[PDB]
């Protein structure tokens, strides 16, 4: 609950998601940063029966950075939680892995953090 | 290509995945570690047109740790790449976020790394 | 340059550091969160000849969470960069590893992100 | 205890460290990968009174990638634990931050994992 809809991160990226009744996330992602253009498919999962003690709702999703316009040979996963209320948020940390040869595998993965809100910066 | 099927990590967990023609990952995950029992739904994405220079194929997927037997109020995302050949591998790093109150949010996310192979340890 | 002094993160923790001329960081850390009390020794390194193109200055430091009052059998490393100017910042991501047995090693490491400023929240 | 000496990771890098009696780590690092040449100064911290229940000993250290031969405008922190015994190990995860402009800050940090042993691969 509260997850379905449009979310914006601190970079200005747009996350459009539908949370299905038994834990599915499905939607599109449009990144304001990096080797990206237009919308990309996403899919993920969320806890559809979270705790009732004030804790957030755990979730995650993946984008592979290939669409009809661009292929960046990479994929990002966001892991985080939804925190409801008047200033609802999805707080995440992410891992972006790029395809790499063996010699470059050590340097294949970026890490960061995105904060999503219902009204953009 | 090469991704569909069963994979095993260094903990003995079992990852069963179908890679669809236009980038979908769908399947089940059974963890040998942590607050888990039996299979959980997963979904993710992969680069369906990887580079041809020897690089791996970028991918990611998510498990929310709720099924009919157990809810651990948490979700893991694996970000990594498939590397084909006689000793094929999926090399990943992962983020596990647990639902948390505001006071505990700083401590909500574990990080680690899993190596998947087609024949178990 | 610009690094020496007192910094505060979003949790209210206090980072007191001296940046030595050839790349040393030395000081104390006081955490507002977790299994911590009073000051802990830190040491780290920074790039003492950063780029002049507007890029930040790369750095990192470590705290082991043992002092005369408390031992949390753990250590945090912060990796990030100093960004100078009127609203100077040290932007970091961190890894906290706790001592663990073999069975619990997979769950030994937390990840997060701290933003330090010269005037507290 | 057991930490002082020379360690080798899976890339063939050489970590030479002295663990001082009250928690200091001091030494040199020579990387077999990336924008590195010869030895770099490191400093870090470790838990000098670990648990006695079979748990490892938490530690961390930092290298800034500047020496007399090369400056890669970046720093790596390793966070992990020492596990003693006949096949002693230091198991780590690391964060490498590169100096970045504001527009590139999102992409400033790599993550990975290194396993150190007392006899090289
Ligand atoms: O730029 C993209 C694709 C778009 C990513 C957008 C990112 S997702 C997390 C963050 N939040 C957003 O909203 N937007 C950004 N992909 C690159 C990254 C850099 N690459 C490498 C290669 C080798 N090693 C490391 C990195 C090459 C591929
Ligand atoms: O144990 C699980 C669910 C099963 C995870 C299994 C993990 S997935 C990555 C790794 N690879 C595998 O194959 N198996 C393991 N969930 C916990 C974790 C610890 N928890 C917290 C709470 C607060 N902060 C931090 C952590 C509570 C919830
Ligand atoms: O709480 C502390 C020591 C203080 C850490 C303070 C942290 S440093 C990053 C952040 N920024 C700050 O300013 N303050 C916080 N240590 C614990 C953590 C949880 N622990 C485990 C055990 C097993 N697996 C995972 C985690 C047990 C030991
Ligand atoms: O290559 C180095 C310095 C040597 C690092 C060696 C690494 S330490 C962890 C691992 N374990 C080892 O033993 N060896 C390797 N530095 C780069 C990295 C890539 N860079 C960027 C820039 C912008 N964003 C992301 C990354 C530019 C600077």
Author numbering:
A (entry chain A), B (entry chain A), C (entry chain A), D (entry chain A): 15 to 135
Per the authors:
We describe here the use of an artificial cofactor employing the well‐known biotin‐streptavidin system to catalyze a Baylis‐Hillman reaction. As protein host, we chose streptavidin, as it can be easily crystallized and thereby supports the design process. There are several examples using streptavidin as the host for these cofactors, since its natural ligand biotin binds strongly (K d∼10−15 M) and is easy to modify with catalysts at the carboxylic acid group. No enzyme is known to naturally catalyze the Baylis‐Hillman reaction, a very versatile and atom‐economic C−C bond forming reaction for the production of various functionalized compounds and intermediates of active pharmaceutical ingredients (APIs).
We chose a derivative of DMAP as the artificial cofactor due to its low steric demand, which will facilitate its inclusion into the protein scaffold. The protein host around the cofactor was rationally designed on the basis of high‐resolution crystal structures obtained after each variation of the amino acid sequence. The location of the catalyst is in a shallow cavity at the surface of the protein. The system was evolved through repeated cycles of mutagenesis, activity tests, and structure determination. According to the presented structures and calculations the catalytically active site is too shallow to undergo interactions with 1.
